[PDB]
Design an enzyme around this catalytic site. Sequence first.
Site, mmCIF file in Angstrom:
data_model
loop_
_atom_site.group_PDB
_atom_site.id
_atom_site.type_symbol
_atom_site.label_atom_id
_atom_site.label_comp_id
_atom_site.label_asym_id
_atom_site.label_seq_id
_atom_site.Cartn_x
_atom_site.Cartn_y
_atom_site.Cartn_z
ATOM 1 N N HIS B 41 0.813 -1.228 0.000
ATOM 2 C CA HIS B 41 0.000 0.000 0.000
ATOM 3 C C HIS B 41 0.856 1.293 0.000
ATOM 4 O O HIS B 41 0.283 2.386 0.164
ATOM 5 C CB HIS B 41 -1.014 0.021 1.161
ATOM 6 C CG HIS B 41 -0.417 0.198 2.527
ATOM 7 N ND1 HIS B 41 -0.532 -0.760 3.514
ATOM 8 C CD2 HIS B 41 0.267 1.231 3.086
ATOM 9 C CE1 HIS B 41 0.071 -0.332 4.612
ATOM 10 N NE2 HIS B 41 0.569 0.871 4.379
ATOM 11 N N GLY B 143 3.219 5.986 9.923
ATOM 12 C CA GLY B 143 4.498 5.627 9.342
ATOM 13 C C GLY B 143 5.189 4.403 9.930
ATOM 14 O O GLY B 143 6.363 4.168 9.641
ATOM 15 N N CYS B 145 4.411 1.364 9.175
ATOM 16 C CA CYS B 145 4.273 0.226 8.282
ATOM 17 C C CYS B 145 5.619 -0.189 7.722
ATOM 18 O O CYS B 145 6.527 0.631 7.535
ATOM 19 C CB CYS B 145 3.284 0.536 7.177
ATOM 20 S SG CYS B 145 1.660 0.724 7.895
HETATM 21 C C1 LIG Z 1 1.280 2.497 7.994
HETATM 22 N N1 LIG Z 1 2.361 3.089 8.241
HETATM 23 C C2 LIG Z 1 0.043 2.725 8.844
HETATM 24 C C3 LIG Z 1 0.263 2.235 10.279
HETATM 25 C C4 LIG Z 1 -0.994 2.514 11.091
HETATM 26 C C5 LIG Z 1 -1.188 4.016 11.286
HETATM 27 C C6 LIG Z 1 -1.459 4.224 12.777
HETATM 28 N N2 LIG Z 1 -1.210 2.933 13.385
HETATM 29 C C7 LIG Z 1 -0.931 1.982 12.492
HETATM 30 O O1 LIG Z 1 -0.673 0.820 12.742
HETATM 31 N N3 LIG Z 1 -1.098 2.028 8.267
HETATM 32 C C8 LIG Z 1 -2.241 2.630 7.942
HETATM 33 O O2 LIG Z 1 -2.520 3.760 8.302
HETATM 34 C C9 LIG Z 1 -3.194 1.861 7.076
HETATM 35 C C10 LIG Z 1 -3.239 2.544 5.712
HETATM 36 C C11 LIG Z 1 -3.359 1.596 4.522
HETATM 37 C C12 LIG Z 1 -4.196 2.292 3.454
HETATM 38 C C13 LIG Z 1 -4.577 1.409 2.271
HETATM 39 C C14 LIG Z 1 -5.256 0.140 2.764
HETATM 40 C C15 LIG Z 1 -4.306 -0.589 3.698
HETATM 41 C C16 LIG Z 1 -4.007 0.274 4.921
HETATM 42 N N4 LIG Z 1 -4.543 1.822 7.592
HETATM 43 C C17 LIG Z 1 -4.858 1.641 8.861
HETATM 44 O O3 LIG Z 1 -4.112 1.124 9.682
HETATM 45 C C18 LIG Z 1 -6.246 2.107 9.206
HETATM 46 N N5 LIG Z 1 -7.128 0.991 9.514
HETATM 47 C C19 LIG Z 1 -8.015 0.568 8.611
HETATM 48 O O4 LIG Z 1 -8.271 1.238 7.618
HETATM 49 C C20 LIG Z 1 -8.691 -0.777 8.849
HETATM 50 F F1 LIG Z 1 -9.307 -1.189 7.748
HETATM 51 F F2 LIG Z 1 -9.585 -0.692 9.822
HETATM 52 F F3 LIG Z 1 -7.787 -1.679 9.194
HETATM 53 C C21 LIG Z 1 -6.222 3.130 10.340
HETATM 54 C C22 LIG Z 1 -5.616 4.439 9.834
HETATM 55 O O5 LIG Z 1 -7.557 3.309 10.832
HETATM 56 C C23 LIG Z 1 -7.691 3.663 12.227
HETATM 57 C C24 LIG Z 1 -7.902 5.171 12.351
HETATM 58 C C25 LIG Z 1 -6.475 3.255 13.052
HETATM 59 C C26 LIG Z 1 -8.906 2.938 12.806
#
Ligand SMILES: *C(=N)[C@H](C[C@@H]1CCNC1=O)NC(=O)[C@H](CC1CCCCC1)NC(=O)[C@@H](NC(=O)C(F)(F)F)[C@@H](C)OC(C)(C)C
EC number: 3.4.19.12
Lengths: 306, 306
Positions: B41, B143, B145
């Site tokens: 991603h 960040g 990931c």
């Molecule tokens: C990557 N560096 C980042 C790490 C996250 C951010 C905060 N804590 C973490 O572990 N990952 C993401 O933000 C990631 C983005 C990516 C976008 C395209 C599809 C794959 C994921 N998304 C999430 O972790 C979000 N969660 C979801 O969307 C889920 F579907 F529910 F898993 C996250 C930003 O959503 C909340 C606000 C943490 C609930």
Amino acid sequence: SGFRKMAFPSGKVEGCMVQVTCGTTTLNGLWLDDVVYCPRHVICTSEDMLNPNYEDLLIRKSNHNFLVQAGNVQLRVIGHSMQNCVLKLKVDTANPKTPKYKFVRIQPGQTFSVLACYNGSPSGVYQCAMRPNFTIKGSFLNGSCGSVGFNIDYDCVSFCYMHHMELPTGVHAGTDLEGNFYGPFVDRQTAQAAGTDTTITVNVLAWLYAAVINGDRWFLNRFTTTLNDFNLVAMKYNYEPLTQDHVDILGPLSAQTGIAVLDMCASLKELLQNGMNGRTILGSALLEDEFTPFDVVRQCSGVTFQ
Amino acid sequence: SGFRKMAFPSGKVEGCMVQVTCGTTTLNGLWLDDVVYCPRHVICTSEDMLNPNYEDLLIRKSNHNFLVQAGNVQLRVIGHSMQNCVLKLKVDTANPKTPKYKFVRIQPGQTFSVLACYNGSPSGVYQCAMRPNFTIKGSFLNGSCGSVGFNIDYDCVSFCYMHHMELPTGVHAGTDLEGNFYGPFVDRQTAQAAGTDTTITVNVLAWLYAAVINGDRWFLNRFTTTLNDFNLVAMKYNYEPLTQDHVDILGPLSAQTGIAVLDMCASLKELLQNGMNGRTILGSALLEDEFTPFDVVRQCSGVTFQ
Ligand SMILES: *C(=N)[C@H](C[C@@H]1CCNC1=O)NC(=O)[C@H](CC1CCCCC1)NC(=O)[C@@H](NC(=O)C(F)(F)F)[C@@H](C)OC(C)(C)C
Ligand SMILES: *C(=N)[C@H](C[C@@H]1CCNC1=O)NC(=O)[C@H](CC1CCCCC1)NC(=O)[C@@H](NC(=O)C(F)(F)F)[C@@H](C)OC(C)(C)C
């Protein structure tokens, strides 16, 4: 999100760990530039442990009595010196993997990371606090002496601990890297006890702020309290007094969460009084005190190192 | 003596961490030989997150769209490929600090160590389990990931986890290093939940053995129980079934302590039934399940690495 007992990455310290062997006694040493630091009780023998006189024990040693491995490589000692309770063994090779480093002597309440080592080979890395009684609740087996504790700050390893001994109560005692014991302990095999420990109040508060930053909010109240009145409840429950300087350190956290410092004090007061009612804060069923305000900010804000 | 959530030393993994940047999106990558692994991603944009089609997203990229830092050094991508949910970016430089390494896909219940990283720079190292619901209770900020999880076994880094996302409940989801998600999660920003979690029974037992090895012994009894009857109590309290294969893994620990496996099962049964009465096992007021029988033996016996 989430909150873990998080240790500094230990790469910079792994490349300083070495084996040190005098006679029948093998323990770990730390190798910085062309010097190897280790606990001076490596020069002891099984009968020299009751009231050792390290000065006479050391005048009787010659350099080749000190076997130093850096891996499968055999270092040569070219001189020895005692500084308080640590041996400083000047060796012919400068460690090329020496990081930028400081020796600091930390106050009770600070935390550090420990790299547990055996035969110069790191086994594991965990996070410790220096308890108010200058002991550490660590994990240490035979031959763990010489393992260090440390903090990292951008690129600099501030070494703050060397491991020397386990006390009868199972907690651990050692020194700063200039060989001064934390607490009143000596490197003798005589009766020594840990001394009453207290809970590190400011850290418990900082952890409760970490909780508010991570979504728990059940433990708050509209109560407030004075510093004077908070300390009266604390000392009952064996907590450290909280100073005004503590309140100030907890400023950034207060301001990031909008919970006044003396308000989180009222929350803790109620928590000590009423318990947790079998709930958990940050996945913990106990008031956690081994996280400094620095730690909370490092973890809930995301500070890195080079 | 003592017992800590102990992580493997992270030096071998710190020297593999790198920054990977596509467009507006910066996250961590892992650098092994001449390949950089990162979550696919990274090629997404703010509007490409609802139902991304990574195949079309990736046909449209050229190599120079991938900015890779190894420190202040700027790596060159010479080819890209997608394997399940991970990008494999072939770069012109082989990482000289590549350890001996394996990719393993671990079963729920195993633990690993996580090196949390931001901008390719390691921030911290902590110990995680893969929960029965294929999530991890980790500590991860924006960040993070591309940070990996791993085990060390003598000299080999078995990488088992890459971090991809945080779920609404605050737990974390990611993949093995071939890009297959643990659990039923997808790298889409759509509704996904964690699924009911259970407690890792065999680990709770192994931790209770660690306690017996470290001096606590208050939780035992002369009761015993059958496996069948133990599982009946477990499932009530949301514990995993314990298999005969579990009993066998717990053999060495049984034999080191002289407490038959089905005897420690009777201890846990009573602990789940009667609670801990506000006591603590190994300084914990909760039944701890993130320690495998391997872990207990590593820590209470002292196993190292090279
Ligand atoms: C990557 N560096 C980042 C790490 C996250 C951010 C905060 N804590 C973490 O572990 N990952 C993401 O933000 C990631 C983005 C990516 C976008 C395209 C599809 C794959 C994921 N998304 C999430 O972790 C979000 N969660 C979801 O969307 C889920 F579907 F529910 F898993 C996250 C930003 O959503 C909340 C606000 C943490 C609930
Ligand atoms: C060094 N590698 C080793 C690390 C110990 C062993 C097990 N866990 C540890 O942390 N240190 C010692 O064994 C050390 C020996 C040394 C001998 C000369 C005088 C200085 C110390 N001694 C101890 O840790 C013992 N404790 C004491 O003697 C004390 F005075 F109470 F602190 C220890 C072996 O004693 C018991 C059995 C742990 C109570």
